[PDB]
Amino acid sequence: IAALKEKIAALKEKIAALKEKIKDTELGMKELNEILIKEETVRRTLHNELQELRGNIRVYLRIRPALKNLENSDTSLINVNEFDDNSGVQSMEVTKIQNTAQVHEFKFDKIFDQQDTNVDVFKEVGQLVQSSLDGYNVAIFAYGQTGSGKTFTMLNPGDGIIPSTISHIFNWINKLKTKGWDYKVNAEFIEIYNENIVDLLRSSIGLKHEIRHDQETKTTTITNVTSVKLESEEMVEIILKKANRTASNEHSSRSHSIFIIHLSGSNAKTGAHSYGTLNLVDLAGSERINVSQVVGDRLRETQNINKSLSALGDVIHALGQPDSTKRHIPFRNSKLTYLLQYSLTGDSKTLMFVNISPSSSHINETLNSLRFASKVNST
């Protein structure tokens, strides 16, 4: 019957129509995926431009919540002004009330107050972690007196800068997989105490840890320091815990701790590569120690910390000046600045977190931290 003969023809025609639909959809998806791959490259460029405009050197103040009853509950000496959207600056004042009021004014790129959580803080820090993934060097420092909240800011479980950073890293790496990107993550975790480097990832006394710079690649290694490949958030959490911050926390408060993350990206579909180093630094307490009745070791420990912190301030101050290439910047003077030199120059991004107490108990030390903050402000 011709009806069946006409039915076969229509089916064979439909077959060819469906096979061509599949081929067209494959082509369309291929084209959509090339847009995605290209757009990731576009995003990196745009993101860096924004980072430049917001400043390669930034200073954030963080006022932690008051602690009862470990300090005076009086927080009235500090006044924080609203973020000025026009100038991009946020100011604050310290006032001592007397016949002639003692006033000290300070300006920051941002001020986080008592109510601002680690989640709030990371809304601003995340963009710098992104820069590292995109192939730029980043240094984030937490500065302030012992008790001001440096370690909480950096390491509070789940939402500290470091755990938030690890989460961001692995989530972004997972997303990038679908766009041709393969990433290797390797880390070192070290301590600087009295201008000596200790490996916090060792698994002992006479081991030499010396800074080695490679001028050609602008990379730095330390001799005999453990480097570990980071494979997941959970794996880092285990590694962090083992390394950790009474004897231990006293030592930790008198030394710098530095978490160094290398983000190595390659795309086989475009031939693109990227390499960024992220440095997360929990600094030695900045408090002025009364050294009069103190023992020699304690005196020298105080001197080294002051030297190290002052050099960091000197270096970052100099880098924020218009005449940065013209003037000489002595990274070599201190072990911290010398170690991090390639993450402080060029296209690198620097963030100084200055942690303070809101309490009247600590007003003098707070003023020191605020003066340090003013020194590291860029022009």
Partner: protein
Amino acid sequence: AALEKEIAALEKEIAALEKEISKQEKFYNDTYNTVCKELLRSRRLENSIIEQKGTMRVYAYVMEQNLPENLLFDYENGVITQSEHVYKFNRVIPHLKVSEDCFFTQEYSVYHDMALNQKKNFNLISLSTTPHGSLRESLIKFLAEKDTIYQKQYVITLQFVFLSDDEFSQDMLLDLKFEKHSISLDSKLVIIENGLEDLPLNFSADEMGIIKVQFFPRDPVPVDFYFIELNNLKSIEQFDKSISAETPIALVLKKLISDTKSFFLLNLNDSKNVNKLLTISEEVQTQ
């Protein structure tokens, strides 16, 4: 029944191919949605960059159906080249790839949400040499359709008038005082709840006109949006006006350009009057 057996074999192959197609559609839709989301991620960065630099927003919307071969468009770098003259733009948008609805969701919504969220009175100034109402049409759909997020958290009101030199000037809905930092109008006030249905049949027709849109937040001060159109050569010539007069047309233009957030859009359509549009876009950025 050999022919009937062949039909069964061809119906089985159709079934196998259609199953493959249905699966493929899922993947395609995911990738298609990701592309749209990633493009918007870029637009957010671009918008943040514009805010930092404080530069004026000037965008080009190009219909290259009947345009000269001499004029070259760089849709990736925001450049139109004639002759060795280079015209700079925030973004040069292809009409072939981006519809009027897509313009508002993909290329405009970031700007819109920003101004609306920081309670800044803002505008869209659209320039064209050929009258076309599908852009104005899409604007209403984007803003004040029943199910939009803007209808959800704001009560939306509209006033549509047309100013002509000189001096009147009429209402476009039927058949001005400058207070503080906003333009008040004594005209017909229409609340939109269902989109173009609440507007007359002559609204999207003809495919200086001023549309004022007010946003009243639900749970006090209304956020103002202004939509300016210049339909032809004569209308844009009056916009130039020695960077000369005090016509009511120029009186509101100067007010919006100085007191509100501006968004300049160039609609390039006809081949005859492209060069005049391009020159004024250069004049807007420099002045």
